[PDB]
């Protein structure tokens, strides 16, 4: 069958970049390398070499000119590759896709190759608030190609071509341990102790799939429980140089299931996170975008067992919270972590950084 290839052309119409993919999957041990082809006419450059750069940047504000505290940009990773004149052979001779592209395009083609490091974060975007006149902070991947006499030379708008890519992850094949937790809250002198137990049916849930929590309450004490409230919390951990954690509730279920003293209780609730009733919340994490199209809630950022440093960008996590409401204090709660992901398809101490960290801590909270 035919193979689709993505391409983009420079505004002057000479420089063109060919890419075999736009979404590069991370396998928690290796990242799919970025291999492409650069087409150029040697007479157009005369003595101007051709360079391609892969950049991932922590950003803020919109892409255009914002009348605000515009983009705080901090490049988490930078790579440079010289398309023409040709670079030495490594890494390896050109791959099968590169060979096919050069055969299709001829001798005007030139391959470029980038190996994304493993510890780089995924592409996520914080949801802008209704009060802001621009998009909020986020981390994204991007590819540029240009011709210049040297790397330090300033960029040219008419000649350079800019293309956006993404880094994505998919659900692991193996299952995880059952998420369950318990908590006790005894009263002044009675051996009777308030006891609740909550558990999930699985550890990994697909997007839009409901969550079942089997809340079990053993209140052998003399107090009365009024309500049980169940919530799903999204944790967006922003790490630039200090770990700032922000919590956003994305789903709540409440029923007036009062519990009599010295009696047990059992129920199996159902809850489902979705984006329909979450568009007004500032600081909600969403998956990265190639354009202004819609995206689901941000998938959890899984970290391999070899969690050496891994602290960059935005890290997303989810937790289900069960809480018992008791008259005159006595609140008791449990939390059940889980991971939310798509199934695998079949086919520096600079002052301005500290200023921006303070600004983000103030604004988001």
């Amino acid at each position, epitope marked *: *069958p*035919g193979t*689709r290839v993505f391409k983009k052309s420079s505004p002057n119409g000479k420089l063109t970049v060919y890419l075999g993919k736009r979404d590069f999957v991370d396998h928690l041990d290796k990242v799919d390398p970025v291999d492409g082809v650069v087409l150029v006419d040697p007479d157009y450059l005369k003595d101007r070499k051709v360079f391609v750069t892969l950049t991932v940047a922590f950003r803020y504000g919109r892409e255009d000119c914002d009348v605000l505290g515009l983009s705080f940009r901090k490049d988490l990773f930078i790579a440079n590759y010289q398309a023409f004149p040709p670079t030495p052979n490594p890494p390896r001779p050109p791959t099968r896709l590169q060979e096919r592209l050069l055969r299709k395009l001829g001798q005007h083609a030139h391959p470029f190759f980038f190996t994304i490091p493993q510890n780089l974060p995924s592409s996520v975007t914080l949801q802008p608030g209704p009060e802001d006149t621009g998009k909020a902070l986020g981390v994204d991947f991007e590819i540029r190609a240009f011709v210049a006499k040297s790397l330090e030379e300033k960029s040219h708008k008419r000649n350079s071509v800019r293309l956006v890519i993404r880094k994505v992850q998919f659900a692991p094949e193996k299952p995880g341990p059952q998420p369950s937790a318990e908590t006790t809250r005894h009263f002044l002198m009675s051996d009777r102790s308030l006891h609740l137990e909550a558990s999930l049916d699985k550890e990994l849930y*697909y*997007h*839009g*799939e*409901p969550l079942n929590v089997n809340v079990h309450v053993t209140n052998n004490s003399t107090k009365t429980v009024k309500k049980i409230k169940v919530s799903v919390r999204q944790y967006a951990d922003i790490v630039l140089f200090s770990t700032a954690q922000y919590k956003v509730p994305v789903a709540q279920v409440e029923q007036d299931d009062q519990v009599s003293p010295s009696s047990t209780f059992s129920k199996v609730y159902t809850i*489902t996170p*979705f*984006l*329909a*009733n979450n*568009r007004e919340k500032r600081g909600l994490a969403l998956d990265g975008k190639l354009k202004h199209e*819609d995206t*689901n809630l941000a998938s959890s950022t899984i970290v391999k067992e070899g969690a050496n440093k891994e602290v960059l960008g935005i890290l997303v996590s989810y937790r289900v919270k069960v809480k018992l409401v008791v008259s005159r204090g006595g609140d008791v709660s449990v939390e059940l972590p889980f991971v939310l992901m*798509h199934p695998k398809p079949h*086919d520096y101490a600079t002052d301005d950084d500290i200023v921006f960290e303070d600004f983000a801590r103030l604004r988001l909270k």
Partner: antibody
Amino acid sequence: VQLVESGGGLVQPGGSLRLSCAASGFNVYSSSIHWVRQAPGKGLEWVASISSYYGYTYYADSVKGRFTISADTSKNTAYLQMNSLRAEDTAVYYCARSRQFWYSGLDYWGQGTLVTV
Amino acid sequence: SDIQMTQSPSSLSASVGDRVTITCRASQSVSSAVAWYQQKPGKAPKLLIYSASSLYSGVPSRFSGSRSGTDFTLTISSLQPEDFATYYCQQYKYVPVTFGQGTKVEI
């Protein structure tokens, strides 16, 4: 996995008919439910669509304003309210289901309810 | 504007063991986002091809789609007596989704 639908029949012109589509075997937030009608002796035509995960609804230009689509997420059902049924609205209305992540065609269909004016 | 999808030939006759190829002209340069459906007389339609080349699970391998620019073609390698029905060509790249006028394979 079945798409049971009902509510079709005979309605006086200018009246209103309410179509209900009751799904089972899947969830309303992981799928989007579409309605497609087959004009008698004529090819298929898309009329409405609802995406309960995002909250968006879409309608065809020929049925816009007259038709309102909604879903009861607790009952895992979808409803199509048709108002001011004109002469050309007679067809067989199919309830279709397509994946939300991501769209890969209408892989599940209902069984068709005849509507006459 | 609404992307009209032209599907030809409209009507044809075939035989068991013959090949059948149905074309589908898109009025605008959509991507491979084209799906093929089959509907027998009296039943509901049935998905066969999605992404204009991927075969739906449970569909016999004799059904095969293709793309050539904006030309989408459905090909049957060896016609069986179960293939006599009406086939529809649907594009889903742009809302509203539009269906072809239909093609019926007959004996």
